[PDB]
Each structure stands twice: as C-alpha cells, then as structure tokens.
C-alpha cells in the first residue's frame, strides 16, 4: 500500500516528543518523506539505532534528503523491498528496524551540524517498524 506521505517539518504533530514518528510499514509498501516549500533547512539520513539514540551522523553518512530549496517540494520515495536505485546496498527487510533522522538545527547555518539538532531537542526522527 501507499502509506501516508510524511512531511519533514517542525510542525508535524506525528513526531512525538519521546518516541518520534513511529510507523509500521509492511514489505511492498511505499512512503514519501517530503520537505514542503515555503523555510526549514534539513539534511535527513537513514541511520542505525545508536546513531538514532545518540542523534549523531558520521562523515561516511550520505543523506537521503537535502532540503535546501525554499521554493521547491523536495520529496524522497521509499519502496520497501530489496531493489533500490540506492548504490550503497541499503534495502529493507521484514522484522527489522530502520531509523531516519537529522541532526540539522533547521537553519541554513546549522544544516550540516553532525551532532544534536532537531532529532535530540525536537524528536525529528522516523522509526520504521518494518513487517
């Protein structure tokens, strides 16, 4: 199924303060994460847990969303399966957990802050409970 598009925004009442936005996709679903156009500035990364639970993204880490276009809808589509244009061997599998965050402070000034951010002070972090 095509689940409910998730707007990466400071306003989003789904990012709950203790446990962020948790969602239960099933294999075969597809999910949009969308930064709307005006502006909050974000780089969003699929992390691991520890990185989630510490709000840290390490140099290696390459982003899934570079939200730095004031007047343009920047949108990323995940289909939960083994095949992705992603060339880094990141896929999705049943009964596994995958953590999407940013350490961005939201300004254009703190965009690339690799530590802290709105993950750790707002709970801007998706938990995808797959399967």
């Amino acid at each position: 199924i095509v689940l409910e598009p998730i707007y990466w925004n400071s306003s989003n009442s789904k990012f709950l303060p203790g446990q962020g936005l948790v969602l239960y996709p099933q294999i075969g679903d597809k999910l949009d994460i969308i930064c709307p156009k005006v502006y909050e500035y974000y780089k969003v990364y699929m992390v691991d847990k520890d990185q989630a639970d510490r709000c840290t993204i390490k140099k290696e880490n390459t982003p899934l969303l570079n939200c730095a276009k004031p007047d343009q809808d920047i949108k990323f589509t995940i289909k939960f399966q083994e095949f992705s244009p992603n060339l880094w061997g990141l896929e999705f599998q049943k009964n596994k957990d995958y953590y999407i965050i940013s350490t961005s402070n939201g300004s254009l000034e703190g965009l690339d802050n690799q530590e802290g951010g709105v993950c750790q002070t707002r709970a801007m972090k998706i938990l995808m409970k797959v399967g």
Binding site: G28, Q72, K75, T77, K79, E82, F83, P85, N86, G89
Partner: protein
C-alpha cells in the same frame, strides 16, 4: 517492422528462463553465443553472504517455435566468490573473454582508495584447457589514471582487438574541468561546481570516475585505458559498447544528475567519441536529489543501469526495458522508441513489481529481429530472487 507510434499491443514478451538473492548479472550476446554471470548471495541482494560466483557461456538457439532459448555450454566458478567484481565480456573467434576485477577490500567503487588495481581475465570456449583459461593481468597501461577497471556488461571486437567498457579513477587533485562549461543556465538553483563535484561519489571524494574502454589486442597481454571524450561528461558508470547494423553504439548509465538516456553511435573508438543522442523521452529512477527527468546539475550519485539497443540506424530506433518509476525500482516495461518519441512499449510485469538492472542485446533469428533482455525482477512475497530472461520479437506490421 513497426515504424509508427501506436498503442496497439503489438509487443508480446515471452519469459524464457530459499532466502537467497541472485544479483550482479551480466549478459552478453555475440553472433550466436552468449555470455553470463551472476552472484549468489545468502539473503539481502546488497549485503548477504556471497554464496557462489558464476560465469558461463553458451548458445542462443531457436528450436521449432522460432523462439530463441538459453543453452549454457560452459560454466565457471571462481574459488572464492567474494573477491571478483564488475565482470564484462567481449566475444572473439570461438571465445568469450571476460574481464573481472579482483579485490581484497570489497567493491572497488566503494573502497577505491584501498583497492589494489588488480585484474584477471577468463576465456571460456563456447563449444568446449581449450575450454577454460585464466589470466592474471600483469601489464596495464592507463596513462594518468591511478588505476582502471572494467565498468559494464559487454564490449566488442575489432579484427584482433577486444574492447571492454571500463572506467578510470583520476584524483580530482589532477582532474581538469572548467566550471563555466557546467550547464546551469535554465537551472535556477544549480551551482557551477555541481558538475565537477558530481564526477565523484562524495563531492569531496579522493577520485573521480571517468568512463572509457579497456583495449586488448590479441595480435600481441597488455590492457590500455582509453577515456571517453569530455562531451556530455557524466561520472563513470557501468556502460556498454556494442556493434549494431555495421557500426558500434555506446551506452552510459545515467548515474548522477543527467538523467536523460546516454547512448549513441561511436564516431571514433580510440580516442572514444560518442555522438550522444539528444533524446528527450527515456530516463531512469533516481532518488530525491536527481530523480527521473532531472536535467539540472546536482551533487548526486544515484540511478540504475538500463541500456537500450539500436535496432534501426536509418531511423535511429532503439529498444530496451525501462523502469517507469521516479525514485523507485519498479515497473519494468519494454520500450521501443526514438530520440523524441516512444513508438510502442510493453509492461513486462504488474505496476508494483520490483525490477532493477535491466539489459538488452538484439539480433536476427531466422531473418527476424529479436531482443533478449535480461532484467532483475521480483514480487513482494517471492521466496528466492533472481534475474529473468525475456525474448521479444519485434513486430513486422503496426497491427496487433
């Protein structure tokens, strides 16, 4: 042979044959014979423990129904399947030769800086040590490039000389690009360094990836890098040169911001000039940064390989399978088309069938135009995942 746009359902694909994933497929097709490889993984297509590498060859045979079919003759397993990567195969005088690279440190594209620039070729008789030979390439001429390596499925022959698709890894500390040439003029947000940054995996990356051919002269054995002309320059990508209707035509995967299809007739082989088509209909799935139908320069490395095949030079008609999806590996559909027009297509699966790394290599069967494709196809629910083979006759008339 249909030359008219039409939505008639003239194209009629025929599928021609536990927790494992077959991936990393190769298919080549020369004059009557075919090459192939895959990798068998335990589990995830990306990470799972690598079961067993194969490399095989055989014949493409029609029987009575005038459908061609796969008849593997000779098959080869390396002793550790972990360390062979990015193989590519060019046929010659009763062999396919296949250039793999070797590695101690994982897929070199992703741990390039630590990669010994080690290579090895395997010649496999198609009609079977005449059957099977190994070579550890010792001399490799690459010019400025620190190291070179194959980069695509298949190549072609020239009298006594093979040509593989390959790639050069120049450190940008030495890479020469004028930023003014980075075409951003209709691109509100796109900066000038884009193109240059986008020649690497990281904008900061140690190397950039330049596309080209690896030269291999059987009349000699030394391999020699030939770089692709700077023209419509895109980061190194899996690509394929292949003979069609008398001259060869090249294709580069659109692995960063130029997401329109990169293919065309080769004007010179060495140095490598490709009269790239100004094609406006085909593209590929990217992600957020460089998704379908992105033309604007961006700092990205994302996409999938989907070659097409020139089936008629006179009216530059090609064909092949395309993933009809913006940012996701889905919806493989066989597409017969031109620069500015898809004539007729055909969906090979459901709307929501997963696909990925498609290939096409066409020929005559019994005086009629056929296209095998490969594909990597699977369905949510499916148990073992592997590439599927599709014949596809090309319609004579533009009737059903």
């Amino acid at each position: 042979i249909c030359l008219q746009k039409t939505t008639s359902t003239i194209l009629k694909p025929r599928l021609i044959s536990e927790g494992v994933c077959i991936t990393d497929p190769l298919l080549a097709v020369d004059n009557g014979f075919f090459a192939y490889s895959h990798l068998e993984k335990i589990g995830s297509c990306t990470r799972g423990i690598a079961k067993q590498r194969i490399i095989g060859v055989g014949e493409v045979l029609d029987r009575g129904d005038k459908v061609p079919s796969m008849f593997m003759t000779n098959v080869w397993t390396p002793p550790n399947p972990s360390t062979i990567h990015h193989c590519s195969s060019t046929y010659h005088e009763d062999f396919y030769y296949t250039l793999c690279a070797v590695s101690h440190v994982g897929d070199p594209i992703l741990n390039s800086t630590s990669w010994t620039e080690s290579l090895s070729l395997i010649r496999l008789a198609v009609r079977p040590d005449y059957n099977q030979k190994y070579i550890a390439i010792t001399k490799v001429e690459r010019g400025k490039y620190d190291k070179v390596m194959p980069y695509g499925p298949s190549g072609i022959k020239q009298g006594d000389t093979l040509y593989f698709p390959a790639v050069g890894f120049l450190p940008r500390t030495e890479f020469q690009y004028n930023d003014s040439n980075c075409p951003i003029i209709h691109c509100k947000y796109s900066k000038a360094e884009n193109c240059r940054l986008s020649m690497g995996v990281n904008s900061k990356s140690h190397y950039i990836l330049r596309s080209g051919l690896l030269k291999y002269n059987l009349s000699l054995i030394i391999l020699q890098f030939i770089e692709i002309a700077d023209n419509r320059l895109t980061i190194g990508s899996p690509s394929k040169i292949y003979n069609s209707l008398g001259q060869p035509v090249f294709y580069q995967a659109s692995y960063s911001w130029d997401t329109m299809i990169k293919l065309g007739d080769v004007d010179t082989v060495d140095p490598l000039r490709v009269q790239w088509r100004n094609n406006s209909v085909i593209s590929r799935p990217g992600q957020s940064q460089c998704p379908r139908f992105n033309v604007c320069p961006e700092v990205c490395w994302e996409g999938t390989y989907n070659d097409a095949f020139l089936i008629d030079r006179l009216n530059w008609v090609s064909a092949g399978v395309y993933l009809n999806s913006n940012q996701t590996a889905e919806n493989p559909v066989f597409a017969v088309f031109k620069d500015n027009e898809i004539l007729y297509q055909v969906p090979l699966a459901e709307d929501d069938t997963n696909a990925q790394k498609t290939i096409t290599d066409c020929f005559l069967l019994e005086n009629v135009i056929w296209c095998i494709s490969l594909v990597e196809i699977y369905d949510t629910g499916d148990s073992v995942i592997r590439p599927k083979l599709f014949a596809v006759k090309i319609p004579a008339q533009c009737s059903e």
